[PDB]
Amino acid sequence: PRYLKGWLEDVVQLSLRRPSLHARPIISLRERILEFNKRNNTAIIAVYKRKSPLNVERDPIEYAKFMERGVVGLAILTEEKYFNGSYEDLRKIASSVSIPILMWDIIVKESQIDDAYNLGADTVGLIVKILTERELKSLLEYARSYGMEPAIVINDENDLDIALRIGARFIIISSHDLETLEINKENQRKLISMVPSDVVKVVASGISERNEIEELRKLGVNAFEIGSSLMRNPEKIKEFI
Numbered sequence: 221p222r223y224l225k226g227w228l229e230d231v232v233q234l235s236l237r238r239p240s241l242h243a244r245p246i247i248s249l250r251e252r253i254l255e256f257n258k259r260n261n262t263a264i265i266a267v268y269k270r271k272s273p274l275n276v277e278r279d280p281i282e283y284a285k286f287m288e289r290g291v292v293g294l295a296i297l298t299e300e301k302y303f304n305g306s307y308e309d310l311r312k313i314a315s316s317v318s319i320p321i322l323m324w325d326i327i328v329k330e331s332q333i334d335d336a337y338n339l340g341a342d343t344v345g346l347i348v349k350i351l352t353e354r355e356l357k358s359l360l361e362y363a364r365s366y367g368m369e370p371a372i373v374i375n376d377e378n379d380l381d382i383a384l385r386i387g388a389r390f391i392i393i394s395s396h397d398l399e400t401l402e403i404n405k406e407n408q409r410k411l412i413s414m415v416p417s418d419v420v421k422v423v424a425s426g427i428s429e430r431n432e433i434e435e436l437r438k439l440g441v442n443a444f445e446i447g448s449s450l451m452r453n454p455e456k457i458k459e460f461i
Contacts, residue, residue, distance in 0.1 A: 236328055243339060249293045250389070263444065266287040270297070276452065287319075288319055296313055310336075413439070430460055
């Protein structure tokens with residue numbers, strides 16, 4: 221991984237030691253989004269997470285069932301220490317619903333992607349700020365050999381530059397600085413404008429308003445990853461969709 225300090229360094233050290241886990245074909249999240257775009261349907265990816273470095277108690281299976289007929293897909297937190305998730309959330313949800321599942325964790329080795337796949341995930345997130353460029357490209361290719369097209373998280377012009385050169389086709393534009401936790405949307409529109417035509421673009425959020433989703437979609441954004449506000453009030457999905 222990259223050199224890190226604070227909670228990032230701690231979470232990556234943990235992930236490097238993540239025990240692997242021996243265990244329905246893939247439904248592409250990327251594809252589904254495209255198809256939702258072609259039908260003029262707002263594509264929301266609802267995030268399940270109990271905590272965030274948020275503290276909600278909500279059943280994973282009920283949440284996923286509730287979201288099932290609305291969302292383009294579900295991202296599930298499997299990171300155990302800061303987000304209070306586990307592989308078992310992913311396992312139960314992937315067995316309970318039939319929409320694409322994105323496994324959200326801090327992926328630093330190959331075995332975590334084996335885990336994603338054997339747990340029933342259709343895709344994974346990879347984070348440009350966590351990894352060297354060579355590690356990113358290697359893990360992207362590893363996920364592809366399983367038939368997963370990963371969503372690569374970018375944060376700035378540097379992130380995108382590396383993501384594009386290694387051949388990413390699916391990109392999450394995050395406005396969160398992972399270290400400081402602060403959300404800054406000021407480079408968001410310019411980042412979105414720099415993404416090529418052939419890439420499926422997801423905005424990651426601190427999204428809570430329909431209005432904001434509409435402005436973004438006008439700019440060409442393909443889908444919307446939404447966490448905190450859905451965890452606080454699942455019912456908001458209706459306004460967003």
